[PDB]
């Protein structure tokens, strides 16, 4: 999770038929996603997300699909950094909204 509220970056994982396209949003933007993604997000912790499901909105598949997106296509900031051999930074706190 990013800042303990939303995903790290916009994603597009395709599970079976469901093509989820969730996008991280500014702190505040409430939970705006498919009913199922909402209850997963409600229990996961995500309280600021937004996205859409295209080909086949297979209710259950959306749910398997969503948690799969969170673990497959959501690399945390540390990983990106350690791996690339660099150090990425967070600028929103460097402003202290």
């Amino acid at each position: 999770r990013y800042e303990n509220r939303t995903i790290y970056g916009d994603i597009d994982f395709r599970y079976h038929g469901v093509k989820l396209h969730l996008r991280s949003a500014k702190p505040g933007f409430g939970l705006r996603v498919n009913h199922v993604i909402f209850e997963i997000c409600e229990c996961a912790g995500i309280k600021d997300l937004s996205g859409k499901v295209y080909k086949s909105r297979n209710d259950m598949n959306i749910a398997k699909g969503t948690i799969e997106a969170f673990t497959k296509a959501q690399k945390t900031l540390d990983e990106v950094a350690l791996g690339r051999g660099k150090k990425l930074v967070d600028v929103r706190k460097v402003y202290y909204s």
Binding site: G9, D10, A81, G83, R84, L88
Partner: protein
């Protein structure tokens, strides 16, 4: 230079990253060299060397008209926690549809705004921009205020 060649390079690197190959070769051209050099500087690659079709060169070999056909760029792929560091390499500008952005729109792309269906830059992604026959980072292009064709979105 040829984006078709760049498209083949980007697809090749993705395929090699999926099969977890440590070392792969790409065609020796100025475009592929500048592309691979930016990936190396940004830490997506472990190494960038000249070579032949057989392997990376051990010693310095001069590039002559006689040997140019055999010359390749050897690129070391990086892996961290059983995952490829170069997970995706996709063209933004296609051979049939080239996307030139002004510096202001490149700045909006870095600031989280979607432009001409190009999704905003995410943390740990790279967008390569072509300005004045050089390839550099999208942020680097904005820093030089060099408006030019966009290129690849590395993630």
């Amino acid at each position: 230079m040829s984006l078709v060649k760049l498209a083949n390079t980007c697809a090749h690197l993705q395929n090699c990253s999926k099969v977890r190959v440590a070392l792969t070769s790409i065609p020796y051209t100025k475009l592929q060299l500048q592309f691979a050099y930016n990936l190396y500087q940004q830490g997506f690659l472990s190494s960038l060397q000249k070579g032949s079709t057989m392997g990376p060169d051990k010693d310095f070999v001069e590039v002559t008209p006689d040997n140019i056909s055999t010359r390749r760029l050897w690129v070391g792929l990086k892996y961290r926690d059983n995952k490829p560091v170069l997970s995706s390499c996709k063209l933004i500008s296609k051979p049939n549809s080239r996307i030139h952005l002004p510096m202001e729109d490149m700045k909006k792309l870095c600031s989280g705004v979607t432009i001409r269906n190009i999704k905003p830059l995410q943390p740990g992604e790279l967008i390569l921009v072509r300005a004045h026959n050089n390839i550099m980072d999208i942020n680097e292009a904005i820093s030089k205020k060099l408006d030019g064709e966009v290129l690849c979105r590395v993630k």
